[PDB]
Design a protein around this ligand. Structure first.
Ligand SMILES: *[C@@H]1O[C@H](CO)[C@@H](O)[C@H](O)[C@H]1NC(C)=O
Ligand SMILES: [Ca+2]
Length: 409
């Protein structure tokens, strides 16, 4: 394999790990965000500002036709297909809806309002993940309204958190996100756009963390934002038994670079607070917040993640790239090694404190330090991931370049 019929050349140089090939399958798209495959293996793409588009594939995974499945200018990121193949869920910043779906024609009908009231203008994506282990359940993310959204200390804020809803008991008129119907799976999660599940059905989420981090040292604010805090994954466990795991936001953050803490011995993965004073101290965080399972580099902006299939026991993560770092970093897809327990729970191979060097590049730009999150990007910016059912093809969207790629084994 070299390329797909009729497909454009890539907008930017693209490097993929030895053993794989990459090529565009689509270009000229409108802000492609979340992507998935339906039960016929068709590609569905949220083109933010246009709607959900559907694309039939050939034997090589290349596109043979394109249509508009949902004509809607508000759906902005989230998409998932129910395991039955006959229902889809997609969301605006404010509302999650379902549609009846016919994969034979890629046709969505009978829009139904599920969950309401979620809008904010700061973190406005509403990731959807339908549980495969419990197909009546679905999770929705609402990120913080601001860098440091103090009300998110409370679950009932409705932000920086993931709730799980029982579709099969959901009122047909739909319900507010903050309601008894939305069981809090995790809160204190600043912006957890990527959500997936392991073979045991545990929900794993990944986070975009704090901007412009500082640390108070001797009553003076020390800028530590270049290399802190870490981006990070949480294992939120069983969505049929939600218990409101607290991830530490808006007070507690995760160390990436210990050297920045000149008066406090830290290791990667430890908690820190910016002021380390009052109630919400480093020690308070250790007693009251649950640690992540793995780290990724500051500001790299994970937006999706997916486990490998078949023989592959890795985690794959789309890093959209930074804006709040110089030089910039991310703008890639990475691989995190892991393993499954006897009952199917995924964990990383590296200990948390050793995880800074555990991950590897899969798909990269020419030079991440030449990319930018301000002005022209000069780079593709990964958003969404999905594996083909055979585990042989990994699709990757890039919103700002209008592209979807195929990575082929
Ligand atoms: C998975 O199997 C393929 C052959 O089908 C092989 O080439 C590859 O080494 C295997 N990978 C792992 C991680 O065992
Ligand atoms: Ca950030």
């Amino acid at each position: 394999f070299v390329s797909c019929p009729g497909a454009p050349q890539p907008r930017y140089q693209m490097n993929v790990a030895n053993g794989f090939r990459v090529a565009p399958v689509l270009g000229g798209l409108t802000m492609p965000r979340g992507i998935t495959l339906d039960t016929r293996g068709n590609l569905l793409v949220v083109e933010r500002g246009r709607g959900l588009t559907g694309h039939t594939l050939d034997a090589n995974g290349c596109v043979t036709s394109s249509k508009v499945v949902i004509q809607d200018t508000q759906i902005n990121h989230g998409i998932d297909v129910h395991p039955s193949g006959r229902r889809i869920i997609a969301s605006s910043g404010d509302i999650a809806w379902s549609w009846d779906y016919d994969p034979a024609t890629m046709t969505a009908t009978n829009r139904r309002t599920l969950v309401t009231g979620m809008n904010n203008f700061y973190h406005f994506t509403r990731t959807v993940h339908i549980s495969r282990k419990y197909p009546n359940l679905f999770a929705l993310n609402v990120g913080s309204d601001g860098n440091i959204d103090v009300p998110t200390r409370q679950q009932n804020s409705g932000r920086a958190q993931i709730r799980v809803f029982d579709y099969d008991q959901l009122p047909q008129n739909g319900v507010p996100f903050v309601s008894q119907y939305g069981r809090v799976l995790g809160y204190g999660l600043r912006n957890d756009v990527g959500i997936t599940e392991d073979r045991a059905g545990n929900i794993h989420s990944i986070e975009n963390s704090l901007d412009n981090a500082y640390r108070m040292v001797n009553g003076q604010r020390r800028d530590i934002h270049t290399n802190n805090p870490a981006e990070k994954v949480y294992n939120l466990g069983d969505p049929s038994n939600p218990r409101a795991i607290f991830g530490g936001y808006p007070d507690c953050y995760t160390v990436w670079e210990p050297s920045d803490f000149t008066d406090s011995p830290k290791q990667p993965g430890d908690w820190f607070t910016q002021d380390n004073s009052g109630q919400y101290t480093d020690a308070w965080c250790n007693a009251n917040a649950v640690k992540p399972t793995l780290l990724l580099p500051p500001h790299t902006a994970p937006l999706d993640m997916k486990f490998g299939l078949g023989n592959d026991t890795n985690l794959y993560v789309a890093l959209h790239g930074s804006w709040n770092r110089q030089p910039p970093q991310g703008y890639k897809v990475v691989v995190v090694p892991g393993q499954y327990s006897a009952s199917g729970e995924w964990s990383p191979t590296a200990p948390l404190a050793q995880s800074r060097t555990a991950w590897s590049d899969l798909l990269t730009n020419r030079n991440e330090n030449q990319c930018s999150g301000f002005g022209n990007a000069n780079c593709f910016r990964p958003v969404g991931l999905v594996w083909s059912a055979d585990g042989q093809n990994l699709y990757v969207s890039s919103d700002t370049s209008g592209e979807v790629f195929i990575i082929k084994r």
